[PDB]
């Protein structure tokens, strides 16, 4: 039911409601699905909109149709830092944003918000060495979803992240 409540607010504010972030972007390869799932977090279910007023406007719409509440990412005044270009020269790592493709070019600011300068590495020992092994710390994620924060916090659990990385392939068109 939330699919066509979603389709209804897109036709109610054309140009203003871009859609759910999972529908607006895709990881470039399947190997990156779990890592992108982990880094994006709850933002992959965020409805990206132009402005915060239209976010509240769609809040009032779903409030009127008994439907379950959703979260909205207003784009226009997003607190976001520019992507650190120099990190592309880091051996063993590429940027998490550099590994997502996204539907319109406006959406890049939503990914910059959700990824920042997070890096994806091919294995845990690489992610650990890039995160903590240098003088500057980096936010890194390995392919199994193990994430290393700059604060030193580590998190993971690959089968729970695999069960929601399959969402990347199932929302791809129902052929029927």
């Amino acid at each position: 039911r939330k699919a066509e409540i979603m389709e209804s607010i897109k036709r109610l504010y054309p140009g203003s409601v871009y859609g759910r972030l999972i529908d607006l972007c895709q990881p470039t390869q399947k190997k990156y699905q779990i890592a992108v799932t982990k880094v994006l977090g709850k933002n992959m279910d965020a409805i990206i909109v132009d402005s915060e007023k239209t976010g509240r406007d769609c809040i009032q719409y779903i409030k009127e149709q008994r439907g379950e509440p959703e979260t909205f990412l207003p784009l226009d005044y997003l607190e976001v830092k520019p992507t650190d270009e120099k990190l592309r020269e880091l051996k063993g790592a590429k940027l998490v944003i550099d590994v997502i493709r996204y539907e319109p070019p406006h959406i890049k600011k939503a990914l910059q918000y959700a990824c920042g300068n997070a890096l994806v590495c091919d294995n845990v020992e690489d992610a650990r060495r890039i995160a903590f092994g240098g003088h500057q710390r980096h936010k890194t994620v390995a392919l199994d979803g193990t994430l290393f924060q700059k604060s030193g916090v580590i998190s993971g659990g690959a089968s729970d992240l695999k069960a929601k990385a399959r969402r990347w392939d199932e929302k791809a068109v129902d052929k029927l």
Partner: protein
């Protein structure tokens, strides 16, 4: 109230450590695993509500010696396809610094009310180090915007360091 993925993570980690224990392997993981934040402190029951409200899910973060211990637990966790989400507080990596608390009759640093062994100090400063326990919600708002620090009352009402309620 507590999320199932966290509870599954606790049980899956209990599985990994017991397996290490029964097979006589990875002694450094066993030595380096200290349990969740909730099982490593006590406080007086009057403070229960504001401590649980401040900690949130970090009550169930796992305190460990190091990042090597975290990733060794996770390597076997993921080998066995175990359910859950786990978060580690690795003592040798936490970059939390000491906080200058203000002089006041109106407030107390919450970490001053937690009884824990000093070997877990970086873990408890990370979770609770920036929080004042205040007499009233009147005084929390003034204390948060005077000394940029989260404030909270004994009944659970909070004022953020940025100014959110």
């Amino acid at each position: 109230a507590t999320g199932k993925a966290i509870l599954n993570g606790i049980d899956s980690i209990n599985k990994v450590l017991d397996h290490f224990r029964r097979k006589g392997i990875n002694q450094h993981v066993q030595n380096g695993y200290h349990g969740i934040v909730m099982n490593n402190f006590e406080c007086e029951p009057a403070f229960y509500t504001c401590v649980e409200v401040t900690a949130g899910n970090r009550l169930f973060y796992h305190i460990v010696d190091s990042d090597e211990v975290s990733t060794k637990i996770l390597m076997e966790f993921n080998k066995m396809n175990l359910p859950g989400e786990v978060t580690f507080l690795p003592l040798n990596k936490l970059d939390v610094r000491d906080t200058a608390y203000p002089e006041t009759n109106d407030a107390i640093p919450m970490i001053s009310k937690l009884r824990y062994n000093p070997r877990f100090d970086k873990a408890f400063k990370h979770v609770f180090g920036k929080t004042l326990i205040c007499r009233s919600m009147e005084v929390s708002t003034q204390l948060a915007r005077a000394f940029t620090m989260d404030c909270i009352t004994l009944e659970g009402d909070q004022v953020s360091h940025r100014g959110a309620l």
